[PDB]
mmCIF file of all heavy atoms in Angstrom:
data_model
loop_
_atom_site.group_PDB
_atom_site.id
_atom_site.type_symbol
_atom_site.label_atom_id
_atom_site.label_comp_id
_atom_site.label_asym_id
_atom_site.label_seq_id
_atom_site.Cartn_x
_atom_site.Cartn_y
_atom_site.Cartn_z
ATOM 1 N N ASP U 451 33.601 5.883 8.839
ATOM 2 C CA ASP U 451 33.624 4.713 9.696
ATOM 3 C C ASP U 451 32.757 3.550 9.174
ATOM 4 O O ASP U 451 31.824 3.753 8.383
ATOM 5 C CB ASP U 451 33.165 5.093 11.087
ATOM 6 C CG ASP U 451 33.488 4.032 12.100
ATOM 7 O OD1 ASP U 451 32.718 3.050 12.201
ATOM 8 O OD2 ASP U 451 34.526 4.183 12.785
ATOM 9 N N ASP U 452 33.054 2.331 9.629
ATOM 10 C CA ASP U 452 32.289 1.164 9.184
ATOM 11 C C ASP U 452 30.852 1.185 9.729
ATOM 12 O O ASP U 452 29.948 0.664 9.081
ATOM 13 C CB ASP U 452 33.001 -0.143 9.574
ATOM 14 C CG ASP U 452 34.177 -0.491 8.633
ATOM 15 O OD1 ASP U 452 34.626 0.378 7.845
ATOM 16 O OD2 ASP U 452 34.666 -1.642 8.688
ATOM 17 N N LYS U 453 30.638 1.792 10.898
ATOM 18 C CA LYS U 453 29.288 1.903 11.463
ATOM 19 C C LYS U 453 28.334 2.520 10.451
ATOM 20 O O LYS U 453 27.162 2.126 10.371
ATOM 21 C CB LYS U 453 29.266 2.743 12.746
ATOM 22 C CG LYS U 453 29.443 1.982 14.033
ATOM 23 C CD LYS U 453 29.945 2.918 15.145
ATOM 24 C CE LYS U 453 30.235 2.191 16.463
ATOM 25 N NZ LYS U 453 29.006 2.101 17.331
ATOM 26 N N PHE U 454 28.828 3.485 9.677
ATOM 27 C CA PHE U 454 27.952 4.177 8.741
ATOM 28 C C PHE U 454 27.789 3.344 7.496
ATOM 29 O O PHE U 454 26.721 3.332 6.925
ATOM 30 C CB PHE U 454 28.459 5.588 8.423
ATOM 31 C CG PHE U 454 28.382 6.493 9.600
ATOM 32 C CD1 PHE U 454 29.527 6.812 10.332
ATOM 33 C CD2 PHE U 454 27.156 6.960 10.045
ATOM 34 C CE1 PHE U 454 29.456 7.626 11.471
ATOM 35 C CE2 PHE U 454 27.077 7.767 11.172
ATOM 36 C CZ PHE U 454 28.233 8.099 11.889
ATOM 37 N N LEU U 455 28.821 2.604 7.107
ATOM 38 C CA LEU U 455 28.677 1.666 5.996
ATOM 39 C C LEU U 455 27.601 0.643 6.286
ATOM 40 O O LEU U 455 26.770 0.351 5.433
ATOM 41 C CB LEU U 455 29.986 0.952 5.701
ATOM 42 C CG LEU U 455 29.832 -0.168 4.673
ATOM 43 C CD1 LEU U 455 29.197 0.306 3.337
ATOM 44 C CD2 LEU U 455 31.182 -0.810 4.448
ATOM 45 N N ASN U 456 27.612 0.112 7.500
ATOM 46 C CA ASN U 456 26.598 -0.834 7.926
ATOM 47 C C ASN U 456 25.221 -0.216 8.011
ATOM 48 O O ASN U 456 24.239 -0.833 7.633
ATOM 49 C CB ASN U 456 26.983 -1.451 9.267
ATOM 50 C CG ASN U 456 28.041 -2.534 9.112
ATOM 51 O OD1 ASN U 456 27.943 -3.381 8.222
ATOM 52 N ND2 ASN U 456 29.071 -2.492 9.952
ATOM 53 N N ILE U 457 25.147 1.014 8.490
ATOM 54 C CA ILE U 457 23.859 1.657 8.694
ATOM 55 C C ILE U 457 23.121 1.859 7.385
ATOM 56 O O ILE U 457 21.924 1.614 7.323
ATOM 57 C CB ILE U 457 24.027 2.999 9.429
ATOM 58 C CG1 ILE U 457 24.074 2.762 10.933
ATOM 59 C CG2 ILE U 457 22.885 3.926 9.141
ATOM 60 C CD1 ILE U 457 24.351 4.005 11.712
ATOM 61 N N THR U 458 23.815 2.289 6.333
ATOM 62 C CA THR U 458 23.099 2.605 5.107
ATOM 63 C C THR U 458 22.783 1.316 4.357
ATOM 64 O O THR U 458 21.801 1.253 3.602
ATOM 65 C CB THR U 458 23.867 3.673 4.200
ATOM 66 O OG1 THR U 458 24.052 3.224 2.846
ATOM 67 C CG2 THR U 458 25.145 4.062 4.778
ATOM 68 N N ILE U 459 23.561 0.266 4.594
ATOM 69 C CA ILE U 459 23.211 -1.020 3.990
ATOM 70 C C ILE U 459 21.923 -1.564 4.630
ATOM 71 O O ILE U 459 20.978 -1.908 3.923
ATOM 72 C CB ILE U 459 24.352 -2.040 4.096
ATOM 73 C CG1 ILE U 459 25.324 -1.825 2.934
ATOM 74 C CG2 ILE U 459 23.799 -3.449 4.028
ATOM 75 C CD1 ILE U 459 26.628 -2.512 3.090
ATOM 76 N N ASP U 460 21.872 -1.608 5.957
ATOM 77 C CA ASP U 460 20.624 -1.905 6.640
ATOM 78 C C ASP U 460 19.484 -0.986 6.154
ATOM 79 O O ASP U 460 18.358 -1.435 5.943
ATOM 80 C CB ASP U 460 20.793 -1.780 8.155
ATOM 81 C CG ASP U 460 21.639 -2.904 8.747
ATOM 82 O OD1 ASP U 460 22.054 -3.790 7.965
ATOM 83 O OD2 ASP U 460 21.879 -2.917 9.984
ATOM 84 N N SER U 461 19.781 0.289 5.956
ATOM 85 C CA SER U 461 18.765 1.228 5.506
ATOM 86 C C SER U 461 18.292 0.886 4.104
ATOM 87 O O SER U 461 17.098 0.998 3.806
ATOM 88 C CB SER U 461 19.284 2.672 5.552
ATOM 89 O OG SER U 461 19.379 3.142 6.888
ATOM 90 N N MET U 462 19.214 0.459 3.249
ATOM 91 C CA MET U 462 18.839 0.029 1.898
ATOM 92 C C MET U 462 17.987 -1.250 1.866
ATOM 93 O O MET U 462 17.153 -1.417 0.981
ATOM 94 C CB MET U 462 20.080 -0.185 1.051
ATOM 95 C CG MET U 462 20.730 1.084 0.589
ATOM 96 S SD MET U 462 22.397 0.788 -0.012
ATOM 97 C CE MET U 462 22.672 2.310 -0.921
ATOM 98 N N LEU U 463 18.201 -2.144 2.826
ATOM 99 C CA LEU U 463 17.448 -3.386 2.897
ATOM 100 C C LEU U 463 16.076 -3.187 3.506
ATOM 101 O O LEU U 463 15.130 -3.904 3.176
ATOM 102 C CB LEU U 463 18.212 -4.418 3.704
ATOM 103 C CG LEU U 463 19.467 -4.881 3.001
ATOM 104 C CD1 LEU U 463 20.198 -5.816 3.916
ATOM 105 C CD2 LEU U 463 19.070 -5.542 1.705
ATOM 106 N N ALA U 464 15.978 -2.213 4.400
ATOM 107 C CA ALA U 464 14.695 -1.793 4.956
ATOM 108 C C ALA U 464 13.792 -1.174 3.897
ATOM 109 O O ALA U 464 12.581 -1.257 4.006
ATOM 110 C CB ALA U 464 14.904 -0.822 6.103
ATOM 111 N N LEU U 465 14.359 -0.560 2.869
ATOM 112 C CA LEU U 465 13.540 -0.078 1.756
ATOM 113 C C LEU U 465 12.748 -1.206 1.146
ATOM 114 O O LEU U 465 13.167 -2.345 1.221
ATOM 115 C CB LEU U 465 14.395 0.551 0.663
ATOM 116 C CG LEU U 465 15.022 1.901 0.951
ATOM 117 C CD1 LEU U 465 15.546 2.506 -0.344
ATOM 118 C CD2 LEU U 465 13.996 2.783 1.638
ATOM 119 N N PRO U 466 11.595 -0.890 0.537
ATOM 120 C CA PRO U 466 10.991 -1.842 -0.408
ATOM 121 C C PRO U 466 11.964 -2.115 -1.560
ATOM 122 O O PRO U 466 12.527 -1.149 -2.068
ATOM 123 C CB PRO U 466 9.742 -1.105 -0.908
ATOM 124 C CG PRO U 466 9.461 -0.054 0.126
ATOM 125 C CD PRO U 466 10.785 0.334 0.700
ATOM 126 N N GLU U 467 12.166 -3.378 -1.940
ATOM 127 C CA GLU U 467 13.005 -3.747 -3.089
ATOM 128 C C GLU U 467 12.800 -2.776 -4.251
ATOM 129 O O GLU U 467 13.755 -2.212 -4.811
ATOM 130 C CB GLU U 467 12.693 -5.181 -3.553
ATOM 131 C CG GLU U 467 13.858 -6.169 -3.463
ATOM 132 C CD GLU U 467 13.609 -7.346 -2.495
ATOM 133 O OE1 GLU U 467 13.881 -7.232 -1.258
ATOM 134 O OE2 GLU U 467 13.150 -8.404 -2.985
ATOM 135 N N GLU U 468 11.529 -2.592 -4.583
ATOM 136 C CA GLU U 468 11.054 -1.626 -5.571
ATOM 137 C C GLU U 468 11.855 -0.311 -5.583
ATOM 138 O O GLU U 468 12.305 0.152 -6.631
ATOM 139 C CB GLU U 468 9.575 -1.358 -5.275
ATOM 140 C CG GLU U 468 8.759 -0.686 -6.353
ATOM 141 C CD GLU U 468 7.336 -0.415 -5.874
ATOM 142 O OE1 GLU U 468 7.086 -0.570 -4.651
ATOM 143 O OE2 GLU U 468 6.474 -0.054 -6.712
ATOM 144 N N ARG U 469 12.052 0.256 -4.395
ATOM 145 C CA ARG U 469 12.644 1.575 -4.239
ATOM 146 C C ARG U 469 14.187 1.550 -4.308
ATOM 147 O O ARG U 469 14.816 2.460 -4.867
ATOM 148 C CB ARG U 469 12.153 2.188 -2.921
ATOM 149 C CG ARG U 469 12.155 3.709 -2.910
ATOM 150 C CD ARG U 469 10.862 4.303 -2.325
ATOM 151 N NE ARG U 469 10.927 5.765 -2.164
ATOM 152 C CZ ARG U 469 11.013 6.645 -3.167
ATOM 153 N NH1 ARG U 469 11.052 6.231 -4.429
ATOM 154 N NH2 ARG U 469 11.068 7.950 -2.909
ATOM 155 N N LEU U 470 14.805 0.505 -3.773
ATOM 156 C CA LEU U 470 16.251 0.367 -3.927
ATOM 157 C C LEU U 470 16.634 0.201 -5.396
ATOM 158 O O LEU U 470 17.633 0.748 -5.829
ATOM 159 C CB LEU U 470 16.779 -0.812 -3.110
ATOM 160 C CG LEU U 470 18.295 -1.027 -3.061
ATOM 161 C CD1 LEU U 470 18.982 0.074 -2.291
ATOM 162 C CD2 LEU U 470 18.614 -2.366 -2.434
ATOM 163 N N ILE U 471 15.842 -0.547 -6.163
ATOM 164 C CA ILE U 471 16.104 -0.694 -7.596
ATOM 165 C C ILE U 471 16.100 0.664 -8.272
ATOM 166 O O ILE U 471 16.913 0.931 -9.138
ATOM 167 C CB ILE U 471 15.055 -1.587 -8.331
ATOM 168 C CG1 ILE U 471 14.884 -2.939 -7.657
ATOM 169 C CG2 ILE U 471 15.471 -1.812 -9.784
ATOM 170 C CD1 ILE U 471 16.073 -3.815 -7.845
ATOM 171 N N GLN U 472 15.164 1.522 -7.888
ATOM 172 C CA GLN U 472 15.043 2.824 -8.525
ATOM 173 C C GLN U 472 16.328 3.635 -8.403
ATOM 174 O O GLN U 472 16.785 4.214 -9.387
ATOM 175 C CB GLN U 472 13.868 3.599 -7.938
ATOM 176 C CG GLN U 472 12.579 3.377 -8.702
ATOM 177 C CD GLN U 472 11.353 3.820 -7.937
ATOM 178 O OE1 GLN U 472 11.450 4.442 -6.875
ATOM 179 N NE2 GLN U 472 10.185 3.482 -8.465
ATOM 180 N N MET U 473 16.923 3.647 -7.207
ATOM 181 C CA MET U 473 18.154 4.401 -6.960
ATOM 182 C C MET U 473 19.285 4.038 -7.910
ATOM 183 O O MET U 473 20.204 4.823 -8.099
ATOM 184 C CB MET U 473 18.628 4.192 -5.528
ATOM 185 C CG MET U 473 17.722 4.789 -4.497
ATOM 186 S SD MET U 473 18.185 4.293 -2.834
ATOM 187 C CE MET U 473 19.912 4.794 -2.809
ATOM 188 N N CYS U 474 19.217 2.845 -8.496
ATOM 189 C CA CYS U 474 20.240 2.367 -9.424
ATOM 190 C C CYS U 474 20.112 3.035 -10.771
ATOM 191 O O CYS U 474 21.056 3.061 -11.554
ATOM 192 C CB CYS U 474 20.147 0.853 -9.609
ATOM 193 S SG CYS U 474 20.329 -0.115 -8.101
ATOM 194 N N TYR U 475 18.933 3.567 -11.046
ATOM 195 C CA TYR U 475 18.688 4.209 -12.327
ATOM 196 C C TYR U 475 18.770 5.731 -12.227
ATOM 197 O O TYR U 475 18.514 6.449 -13.204
ATOM 198 C CB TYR U 475 17.332 3.768 -12.849
ATOM 199 C CG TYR U 475 17.330 2.303 -13.103
ATOM 200 C CD1 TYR U 475 16.369 1.477 -12.549
ATOM 201 C CD2 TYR U 475 18.339 1.735 -13.850
ATOM 202 C CE1 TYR U 475 16.395 0.116 -12.772
ATOM 203 C CE2 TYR U 475 18.381 0.390 -14.081
ATOM 204 C CZ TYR U 475 17.408 -0.420 -13.547
ATOM 205 O OH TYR U 475 17.474 -1.770 -13.797
ATOM 206 N N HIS U 476 19.160 6.201 -11.043
ATOM 207 C CA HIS U 476 19.154 7.613 -10.717
ATOM 208 C C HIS U 476 20.548 8.215 -10.865
ATOM 209 O O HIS U 476 21.491 7.763 -10.237
ATOM 210 C CB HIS U 476 18.623 7.807 -9.295
ATOM 211 C CG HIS U 476 18.287 9.228 -8.947
ATOM 212 N ND1 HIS U 476 19.223 10.125 -8.480
ATOM 213 C CD2 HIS U 476 17.106 9.893 -8.960
ATOM 214 C CE1 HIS U 476 18.639 11.286 -8.239
ATOM 215 N NE2 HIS U 476 17.355 11.171 -8.520
ATOM 216 N N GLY U 477 20.659 9.244 -11.696
ATOM 217 C CA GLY U 477 21.909 9.941 -11.928
ATOM 218 C C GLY U 477 22.749 10.217 -10.705
ATOM 219 O O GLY U 477 23.963 10.071 -10.735
ATOM 220 N N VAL U 478 22.106 10.601 -9.620
ATOM 221 C CA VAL U 478 22.829 10.973 -8.425
ATOM 222 C C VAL U 478 22.869 9.815 -7.424
ATOM 223 O O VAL U 478 23.929 9.471 -6.894
ATOM 224 C CB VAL U 478 22.196 12.228 -7.794
ATOM 225 C CG1 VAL U 478 22.567 12.379 -6.346
ATOM 226 C CG2 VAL U 478 22.618 13.448 -8.573
ATOM 227 N N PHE U 479 21.723 9.186 -7.195
ATOM 228 C CA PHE U 479 21.627 8.203 -6.124
ATOM 229 C C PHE U 479 22.313 6.881 -6.462
ATOM 230 O O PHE U 479 22.707 6.153 -5.554
ATOM 231 C CB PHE U 479 20.162 7.967 -5.749
ATOM 232 C CG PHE U 479 19.540 9.120 -5.004
ATOM 233 C CD1 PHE U 479 18.248 9.528 -5.283
ATOM 234 C CD2 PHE U 479 20.263 9.812 -4.042
ATOM 235 C CE1 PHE U 479 17.687 10.590 -4.609
ATOM 236 C CE2 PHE U 479 19.695 10.875 -3.357
ATOM 237 C CZ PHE U 479 18.403 11.262 -3.645
ATOM 238 N N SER U 480 22.489 6.591 -7.750
ATOM 239 C CA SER U 480 23.233 5.405 -8.169
ATOM 240 C C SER U 480 24.651 5.396 -7.604
ATOM 241 O O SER U 480 25.238 4.340 -7.364
ATOM 242 C CB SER U 480 23.283 5.310 -9.685
ATOM 243 O OG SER U 480 23.969 6.419 -10.244
ATOM 244 N N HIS U 481 25.192 6.580 -7.381
ATOM 245 C CA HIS U 481 26.499 6.703 -6.779
ATOM 246 C C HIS U 481 26.471 6.232 -5.336
ATOM 247 O O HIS U 481 27.488 5.832 -4.795
ATOM 248 C CB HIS U 481 26.990 8.151 -6.865
ATOM 249 C CG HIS U 481 27.518 8.520 -8.215
ATOM 250 N ND1 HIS U 481 28.831 8.298 -8.585
ATOM 251 C CD2 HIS U 481 26.911 9.071 -9.293
ATOM 252 C CE1 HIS U 481 29.007 8.700 -9.831
ATOM 253 N NE2 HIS U 481 27.859 9.175 -10.284
ATOM 254 N N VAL U 482 25.307 6.280 -4.707
ATOM 255 C CA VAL U 482 25.232 5.938 -3.300
ATOM 256 C C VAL U 482 25.243 4.419 -3.166
ATOM 257 O O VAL U 482 25.936 3.873 -2.300
ATOM 258 C CB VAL U 482 23.983 6.537 -2.630
ATOM 259 C CG1 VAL U 482 23.935 6.162 -1.136
ATOM 260 C CG2 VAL U 482 23.994 8.034 -2.797
ATOM 261 N N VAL U 483 24.478 3.752 -4.033
ATOM 262 C CA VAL U 483 24.471 2.299 -4.115
ATOM 263 C C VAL U 483 25.864 1.796 -4.450
ATOM 264 O O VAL U 483 26.384 0.888 -3.789
ATOM 265 C CB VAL U 483 23.507 1.772 -5.189
ATOM 266 C CG1 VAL U 483 23.633 0.247 -5.286
ATOM 267 C CG2 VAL U 483 22.081 2.203 -4.898
ATOM 268 N N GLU U 484 26.457 2.394 -5.483
ATOM 269 C CA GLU U 484 27.794 2.017 -5.918
ATOM 270 C C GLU U 484 28.781 2.119 -4.750
ATOM 271 O O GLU U 484 29.712 1.322 -4.640
ATOM 272 C CB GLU U 484 28.262 2.890 -7.099
ATOM 273 C CG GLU U 484 29.335 2.231 -7.974
ATOM 274 C CD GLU U 484 30.015 3.185 -8.989
ATOM 275 O OE1 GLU U 484 29.437 4.264 -9.272
ATOM 276 O OE2 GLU U 484 31.128 2.851 -9.505
ATOM 277 N N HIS U 485 28.559 3.083 -3.864
ATOM 278 C CA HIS U 485 29.537 3.404 -2.829
ATOM 279 C C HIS U 485 29.528 2.393 -1.691
ATOM 280 O O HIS U 485 30.458 2.305 -0.891
ATOM 281 C CB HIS U 485 29.276 4.793 -2.270
ATOM 282 C CG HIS U 485 30.469 5.397 -1.612
ATOM 283 N ND1 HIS U 485 31.456 6.051 -2.320
ATOM 284 C CD2 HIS U 485 30.857 5.426 -0.313
ATOM 285 C CE1 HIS U 485 32.392 6.466 -1.485
ATOM 286 N NE2 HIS U 485 32.052 6.100 -0.261
ATOM 287 N N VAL U 486 28.444 1.640 -1.632
ATOM 288 C CA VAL U 486 28.197 0.687 -0.582
ATOM 289 C C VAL U 486 28.880 -0.637 -0.936
ATOM 290 O O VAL U 486 29.342 -1.361 -0.070
ATOM 291 C CB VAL U 486 26.680 0.548 -0.399
ATOM 292 C CG1 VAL U 486 26.232 -0.896 -0.412
ATOM 293 C CG2 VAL U 486 26.236 1.270 0.856
ATOM 294 N N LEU U 487 28.983 -0.916 -2.233
ATOM 295 C CA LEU U 487 29.557 -2.158 -2.742
ATOM 296 C C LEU U 487 31.088 -2.314 -2.511
ATOM 297 O O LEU U 487 31.862 -2.516 -3.459
ATOM 298 C CB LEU U 487 29.244 -2.273 -4.231
ATOM 299 C CG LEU U 487 27.880 -2.829 -4.645
ATOM 300 C CD1 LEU U 487 27.030 -3.152 -3.460
ATOM 301 C CD2 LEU U 487 27.152 -1.901 -5.595
ATOM 302 N N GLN U 488 31.498 -2.233 -1.246
ATOM 303 C CA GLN U 488 32.892 -2.392 -0.822
ATOM 304 C C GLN U 488 33.182 -3.772 -0.206
ATOM 305 O O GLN U 488 33.055 -3.965 1.012
ATOM 306 C CB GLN U 488 33.252 -1.300 0.186
ATOM 307 C CG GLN U 488 32.993 0.081 -0.360
ATOM 308 C CD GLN U 488 33.594 1.165 0.498
ATOM 309 O OE1 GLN U 488 34.635 0.971 1.131
ATOM 310 N NE2 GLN U 488 32.943 2.320 0.527
ATOM 311 N N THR U 489 33.626 -4.690 -1.067
ATOM 312 C CA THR U 489 33.754 -6.117 -0.776
ATOM 313 C C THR U 489 34.434 -6.470 0.548
ATOM 314 O O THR U 489 33.823 -7.109 1.405
ATOM 315 C CB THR U 489 34.514 -6.823 -1.905
ATOM 316 O OG1 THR U 489 34.122 -6.275 -3.173
ATOM 317 C CG2 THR U 489 34.204 -8.302 -1.897
ATOM 318 N N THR U 490 35.683 -6.070 0.738
ATOM 319 C CA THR U 490 36.384 -6.433 1.976
ATOM 320 C C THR U 490 35.829 -5.782 3.244
ATOM 321 O O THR U 490 36.282 -6.072 4.360
ATOM 322 C CB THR U 490 37.862 -6.077 1.898
ATOM 323 O OG1 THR U 490 37.996 -4.663 1.782
ATOM 324 C CG2 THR U 490 38.494 -6.728 0.700
ATOM 325 N N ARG U 491 34.844 -4.914 3.091
ATOM 326 C CA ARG U 491 34.381 -4.085 4.198
ATOM 327 C C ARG U 491 32.966 -4.461 4.674
ATOM 328 O O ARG U 491 32.560 -4.089 5.762
ATOM 329 C CB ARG U 491 34.433 -2.632 3.750
ATOM 330 C CG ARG U 491 34.720 -1.660 4.829
ATOM 331 C CD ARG U 491 35.603 -0.550 4.307
ATOM 332 N NE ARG U 491 34.858 0.623 3.862
ATOM 333 C CZ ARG U 491 34.322 1.527 4.671
ATOM 334 N NH1 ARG U 491 34.409 1.405 5.987
ATOM 335 N NH2 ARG U 491 33.688 2.562 4.153
ATOM 336 N N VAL U 492 32.236 -5.192 3.828
ATOM 337 C CA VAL U 492 30.868 -5.646 4.073
ATOM 338 C C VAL U 492 30.815 -7.165 4.250
ATOM 339 O O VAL U 492 31.162 -7.891 3.316
ATOM 340 C CB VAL U 492 29.934 -5.286 2.902
ATOM 341 C CG1 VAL U 492 28.507 -5.547 3.275
ATOM 342 C CG2 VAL U 492 30.117 -3.839 2.478
ATOM 343 N N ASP U 493 30.374 -7.639 5.422
ATOM 344 C CA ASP U 493 30.299 -9.067 5.719
ATOM 345 C C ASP U 493 29.440 -9.847 4.727
ATOM 346 O O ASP U 493 28.492 -9.299 4.160
ATOM 347 C CB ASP U 493 29.754 -9.291 7.116
ATOM 348 C CG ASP U 493 28.305 -8.884 7.249
ATOM 349 O OD1 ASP U 493 27.419 -9.631 6.758
ATOM 350 O OD2 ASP U 493 28.043 -7.815 7.860
ATOM 351 N N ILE U 494 29.751 -11.136 4.554
ATOM 352 C CA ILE U 494 29.199 -11.924 3.443
ATOM 353 C C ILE U 494 27.683 -12.089 3.490
ATOM 354 O O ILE U 494 27.062 -12.193 2.438
ATOM 355 C CB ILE U 494 29.849 -13.335 3.358
ATOM 356 C CG1 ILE U 494 29.410 -14.054 2.083
ATOM 357 C CG2 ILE U 494 29.537 -14.167 4.586
ATOM 358 C CD1 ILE U 494 30.318 -15.174 1.695
#
């Protein structure tokens, strides 16, 4: 559901910038960031 797409995006923004950047370099967690980047589904 979109509620969960919104929730983890808010959750990612609540992180310190520092820590969200780290997930991008992480073998497993980079997939989570990648999964959020759904253009037509996330408001501008």
Side-chain angles (χ1 to χ4, degrees):
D451 194 278
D452 282 14
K453 269 158 184 272
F454 293 103
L455 172 55
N456 282 315
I457 275 175
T458 127
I459 276 166
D460 289 358
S461 287
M462 285 165 163
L463 292 176
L465 288 193
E467 242 117 273
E468 196 183 11
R469 206 135 173 66
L470 185 68
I471 307 289
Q472 268 164 8
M473 293 171 55
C474 301
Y475 297 126
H476 193 275
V478 160
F479 288 139
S480 63
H481 282 273
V482 180
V483 176
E484 204 191 342
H485 202 83
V486 129
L487 277 1
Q488 305 192 32
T489 321
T490 64
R491 212 143 95 77
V492 190
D493 67 75
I494 188 160

